[PDB]
Design a protein around this ligand. Structure first.
Ligand SMILES: NC(=O)c1ccc[n+]([C@@H]2O[C@H](COP(=O)([O-])OP(=O)(O)OC[C@H]3O[C@@H](n4cnc5c(N)ncnc54)[C@H](OP(=O)(O)O)[C@H]3O)[C@@H](O)[C@H]2O)c1
Ligand SMILES: Nc1nc(=O)c2nc(CNc3ccc(C(=O)N[C@@H](CCC(=O)O)C(=O)O)cc3)cnc2[nH]1
Length: 159
């Protein structure tokens, strides 16, 4: 009902310098499939990192300050972000670190890509209690010519 989606390297690293230290087209395709036609909520830094709207999704940006682009919807608290989604089945929270930790307790579902990459970064996915979560889907993929690490797509349900 609220879901988080994220891609985690070793030690739960999710970013460095406001970009993601890997480039895996197969994972971005997974992200697009699981977010298409659903509202996405992101923090202002992630909005900057992405650099443009995500098409085919209502884009909701969290910021304390006035917004700077009317192609997306701007909100000033977690409460307001959820409301702005409108009355839907599934809201997708798309990060970054600070936003994930605030939505985690409200979330029923995690879509996590576990990437076998050793990255030196400055942003992490939450240190979540694993006992809270049932793994209901896993798909491991070897690296290939397009994807320069192995990666595993998991979906976790809150127990
Ligand atoms: N690996 C992945 O899947 C993934 C996914 C997403 C992002 N990332 C990475 O994560 C990094 C960005 O994460 P962190 O630094 O993300 O920033 P963030 O969580 O994207 O953005 C944080 C900002 O959002 C606003 N915000 C957050 N909570 C708010 C609240 N309750 N009320 C009002 N404003 C709120 C604030 O903006 P103001 O300062 O304007 O108030 C603020 O904290 C980047 O490196 C990005 O590449 C990785
Ligand atoms: N699993 C997962 N992987 C990610 O890379 C990811 N990235 C973010 C934040 N950053 C981004 C950055 C770019 C795009 C992006 O360009 N996505 C396209 C896919 C098109 C393609 O295949 O290149 C999209 O339309 O979603 C999405 C999120 C949030 N959650 C994630 N979750």
């Amino acid at each position: 009902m609220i879901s988080l989606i994220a891609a985690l390297a070793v030690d739960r690293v999710i970013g460095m310098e406001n970009a993601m230290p890997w480039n895996l087209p197969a994972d971005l395709a997974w992200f697009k499939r699981n977010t298409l036609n659903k509202p996405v909520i992101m923090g202002r830094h992630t909005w900057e990192s992405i650099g443009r709207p995500l098409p085919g999704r209502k884009n909701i940006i969290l910021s304390s300050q006035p917004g700077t682009d009317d192609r997306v919807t701007w909100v000033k608290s977690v409460d307001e972000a959820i409301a702005a989604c409108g009355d839907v089945p599934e809201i997708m929270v798309i990060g970054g670190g600070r936003v994930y930790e605030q939505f985690l307790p409200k979330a029923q579902k995690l879509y996590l890509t576990h990437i076998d990459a050793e990255v030196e970064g400055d942003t992490h996915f939450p240190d979540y209690e694993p006992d809270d979560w049932e793994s209901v889907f896993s798909e491991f993929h070897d690296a290939d010519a397009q994807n320069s690490h192995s990666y595993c797509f998991e979906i976790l349900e809150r127990r």
